[PDB]
Amino acid sequence: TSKATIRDLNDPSQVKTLQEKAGKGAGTVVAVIDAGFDKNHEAWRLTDKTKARYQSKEDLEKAKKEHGITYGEWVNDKVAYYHDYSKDGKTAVDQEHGTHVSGILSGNAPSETKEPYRLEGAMPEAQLLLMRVEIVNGLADYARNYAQAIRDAINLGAKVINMSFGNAALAYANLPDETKKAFDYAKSKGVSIVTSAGNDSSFGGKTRLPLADHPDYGVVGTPAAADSTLTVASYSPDKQLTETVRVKTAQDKEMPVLSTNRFEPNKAYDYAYANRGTKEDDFKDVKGKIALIERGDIDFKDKIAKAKKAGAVGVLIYDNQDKGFPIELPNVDQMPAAFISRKDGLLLKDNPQKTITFNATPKVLPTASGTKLSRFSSWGLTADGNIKPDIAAPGQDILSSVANNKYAKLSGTSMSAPLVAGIMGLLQKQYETQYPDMTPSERLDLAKKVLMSSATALYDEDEKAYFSPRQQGAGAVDAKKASAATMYVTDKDNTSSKVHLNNVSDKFEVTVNVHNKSDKPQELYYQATVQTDKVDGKHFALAPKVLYEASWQKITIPANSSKQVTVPIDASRFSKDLLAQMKNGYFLEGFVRFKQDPKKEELMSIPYIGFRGDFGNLSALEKPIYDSKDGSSYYHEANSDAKDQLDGDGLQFYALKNNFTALTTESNPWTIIKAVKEGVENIEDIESSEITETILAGTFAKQDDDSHYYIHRHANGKPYAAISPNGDGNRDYVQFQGTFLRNAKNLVAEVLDKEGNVVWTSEVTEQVVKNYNNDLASTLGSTRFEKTRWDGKDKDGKVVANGTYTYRVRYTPISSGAKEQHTDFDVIVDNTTPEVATSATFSTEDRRLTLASKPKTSQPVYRERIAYTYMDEDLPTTEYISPNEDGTFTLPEEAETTEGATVPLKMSDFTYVVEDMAGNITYTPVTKLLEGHS
Numbered sequence: 001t002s003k004a005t006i007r008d009l010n011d012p013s014q015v016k017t018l019q020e021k022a023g024k025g026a027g028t029v030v031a032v033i034d035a036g037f038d039k040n041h042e043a044w045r046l047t048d049k050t051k052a053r054y055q056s057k058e059d060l061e062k063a064k065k066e067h068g069i070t071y072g073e074w075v076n077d078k079v080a081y082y083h084d085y086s087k088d089g090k091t092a093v094d095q096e097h098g099t100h101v102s103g104i105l106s107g108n109a110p111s112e113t114k115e116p117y118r119l120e121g122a123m124p125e126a127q128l129l130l131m132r133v134e135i136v137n138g139l140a141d142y143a144r145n146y147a148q149a150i151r152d153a154i155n156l157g158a159k160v161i162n163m164s165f166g167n168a169a170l171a172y173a174n175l176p177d178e179t180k181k182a183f184d185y186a187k188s189k190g191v192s193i194v195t196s197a198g199n200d201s202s203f204g205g206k207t208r209l210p211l212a213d214h215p216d217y218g219v220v221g222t223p224a225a226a227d228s229t230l231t232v233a234s235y236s237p238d239k240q241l242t243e244t245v246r247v248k249t250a251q252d253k254e255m256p257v258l259s260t261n262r263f264e265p266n267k268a269y270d271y272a273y274a275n276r277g278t279k280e281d282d283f284k285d286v287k288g289k290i291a292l293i294e295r296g297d298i299d300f301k302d303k304i305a306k307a308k309k310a311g312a313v314g315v316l317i318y319d320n321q322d323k324g325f326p327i328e329l330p331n332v333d334q335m336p337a338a339f340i341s342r343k344d345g346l347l348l349k350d351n352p353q354k355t356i357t358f359n360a361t362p363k364v365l366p367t368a369s370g371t372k373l374s375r376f377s378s379w380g381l382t383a384d385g386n387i388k389p390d391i392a393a394p395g396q397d398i399l400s401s402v403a404n405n406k407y408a409k410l411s412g413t414s415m416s417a418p419l420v421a422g423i424m425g426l427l428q429k430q431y432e433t434q435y436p437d438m439t440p441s442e443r444l445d446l447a448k449k450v451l452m453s454s455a456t457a458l459y460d461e462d463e464k465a466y467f468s469p470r471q472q473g474a475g476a477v478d479a480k481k482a483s484a485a486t487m488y489v490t491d492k493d494n495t496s497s498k499v500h501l502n503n504v505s506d507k508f509e510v511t512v513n514v515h516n517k518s519d520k521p522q523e524l525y526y527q528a529t530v531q532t533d534k535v536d537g538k539h540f541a542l543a544p545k546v547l548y549e550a551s552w553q554k555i556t557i558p559a560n561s562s563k564q565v566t567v568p569i570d571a572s573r574f575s576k577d578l579l580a581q582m583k584n585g586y587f588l589e590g591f592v593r594f595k596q597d598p599k600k601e602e603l604m605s606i607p608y609i610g611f612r613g614d615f616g617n618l619s620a621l622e623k624p625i626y627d628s629k630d631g632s633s634y635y636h637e638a639n640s641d642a643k644d645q646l647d648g649d650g651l652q653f654y655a656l657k658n659n660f661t662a663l664t665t666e667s668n669p670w671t672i673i674k675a676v677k678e679g680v681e682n683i684e685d686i687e688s689s690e691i692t693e694t695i696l697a698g699t700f701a702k703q704d705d706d707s708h709y710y711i712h713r714h715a716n717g718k719p720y721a722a723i724s725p726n727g728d729g730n731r732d733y734v735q736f737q738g739t740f741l742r743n744a745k746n747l748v749a750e751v752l753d754k755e756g757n758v759v760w761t762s763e764v765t766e767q768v769v770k771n772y773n774n775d776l777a778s779t780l781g782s783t784r785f786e787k788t789r790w791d792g793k794d795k796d797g798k799v800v801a802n803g804t805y806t807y808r809v810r811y812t813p814i815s816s817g818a819k820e821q822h823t824d825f826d827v828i829v830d831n832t833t834p835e836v837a838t839s840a841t842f843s844t845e846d847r848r849l850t851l852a853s854k855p856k857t858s859q860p861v862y863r864e865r866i867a868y869t870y871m872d873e874d875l876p877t878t879e880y881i882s883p884n885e886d887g888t889f890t891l892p893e894e895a896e897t898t899e900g901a902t903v904p905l906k907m908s909d910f911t912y913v914v915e916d917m918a919g920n921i922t923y924t925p926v927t928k929l930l931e932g933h934s
């Protein structure tokens, strides 16, 4: 018959209450800017097209003509306009994400749908403008393209623009000027722009906690960092519509599942516990059953693959966290795989009857998380220190429209944003009747303030404190409270419903202006929470710590007026213990919460954030790896048995290892140097078995090579960085590699001669983004800055004199007024070629080679060796002999191949190779030394 909608069962943000007041979007236009869409999805329909702004393609083309828009097309009655702003892209168009976002905003699935419940988004009777943008030619081009989409959406009549995309940590200041002006244009026209906060958690990413020493751990980027947009974080309500399983316990019992691929509904499956699935013995009894597997130790896909190997028909993976979130499991060759909570997995593990049934229709059940901010949701602050996100909305396991007329659950701030966008659109409609004498810009400003003020500050029940405003903004959107609101709260300058205090001492004041738009005076009680970061050892826990709550005050605000209040804060008695945990300073933040009576529910809340310290001047760069006491850094674990081991790149394709602050250089072995100087064109895997390797400056192999490099240091503890700028590719240069804890600007390298002169300056790297993860899917843990490469030459192109120089790297934080920072390395330049024996004698009896003289080098000797190069399956293969203690070398008679065959060695196979610590090198055939007699 007529199917219920999802919202009929499950409306965590109370959208129905606002729809009762303001409608469902008929006659309104909204826009979605995303990566691609299924433009034909069944969810794209209007109940009554006669009420639409655009009743035909001709209506659309008329509006296109009035604004000089000569591109884009009408699609159907719902999708009034589509344009692809990134058609020069070579990659295939991804349709899932944009369709899913658009469905939350404006899906209107028919009752003929195959799904059990109709997807009905927040503004299901609005028309859509669908604008595709994707990164093709860099981020500035990308922002110019979505700036045009914004401008076109405004001029085609969109009242709301949803942008569920972003690039982490980027500064607003670095956006193209035309992108900044597009945001301002939307604001000036009363068009709301809603942005997703991002799914990057904090510095370090969703698998890591940031270090307590480094409080500027925000990763919100652009477009979200634009102040005029409304930026949306993700949380889980304490209940959610979910697919379920049924089990008989020690009575029936229903449990939430999140399934990848499809179990057979209404089928009783047997299941068997397989521990964490880390060995084959784990799966000894899963054949023909579902494998119950605890999260941990290994990847999900590995657990699932091994269960499939053992004959399992499906997989249940249960969390190793208490109060966790469902995680969408990977699709491994269509294997049914469902994620369940720890409590439910432990229940099944010890359950007598190991049988389980999957239900075909979903139902609302409590979440394992309770009311809790999503672990993936991006934290503020922005790069220049502004407060983002602004607000939170449900973004866990949201069911919406995807490609090919299908539906699926996705999690992300991308899902939270379009729900807020639809609430914004409907509240703007309400205000067209409620405040008709306001301009569109005034109504938009009011709507943003009311949404943020009326948003409910979410409370962390585990920590007994409100989640940080740098995680939840002004709280969880509530369309019922928003629609009912006749008041709102702002900072003292009336610019936004949040208070940014910048740097504070232990005593400060939180000032709020309380705005009353009703015709009657109103009395409110208000109380400030005072809170900071919880710390576990050396890490932020990414959880709140309450310090205290101020005493309740009250105020009466006259009708159609505003009144300022001030809450004094004094955290002085906490400072000793807080500095012990957060030695470079810490946030002092919280919410001013307003009620009609202290015993009633929260009516409004406004977040405030200050930083007890000097935020702008926090170190932007992680200290060089060389200075680490234990050899570890944020993204690099030391070898516990050899803290000075520090290997180079090897033959790795991706640079996932050894991400830290350091200088790079290159090791070029003598066989490659020789081949290049002889003009050999095809070297690798052909002329030599040795490799050119990018390594860390100041590292050196042992003479008997164990395949590792080790830091060497001057007696003063600085790394022994040294270069030989003679153009052979062996240690010719140094180049800065940085793990940036904070964004920075105007990064430049220069060389001081330690006599008072700058002798060389690099080109400037204008924009530096913090290394907020160490993952190919986002960013690596360190960045190599090619512009800083120093070839040992001065500003006139002349190699500097042999000596020690300061290689200085300068960079400035983004924060207003921050001082320039710098990090210095001593670098030795020495181009003296080793002076070595030109003759030798050879004793056949004991096979000892005696050199006529010993090496004389400017820098200390690095290696003095005899190489032998022998054929191994058509490849000249080089191994090395170290000197005897009497200075001779014992030459072997044969070598052994990898496959085990004996290869006789000839005198012509041996080469004498001497190298110093700057990379200066000589290589002489042993046969030439033996001929060095008259």
Ligand SMILES: [Ca+2]
Binding pocket: 723, 724, 725, 726, 727, 728, 729, 730, 731, 732, 919, 920
């Ligand atoms: Ca060199």
Ligand code: NA
Binding pocket: 452, 453, 454, 455, 456, 457, 474, 475, 604, 605, 606, 607
């Ligand atoms: Na609020």
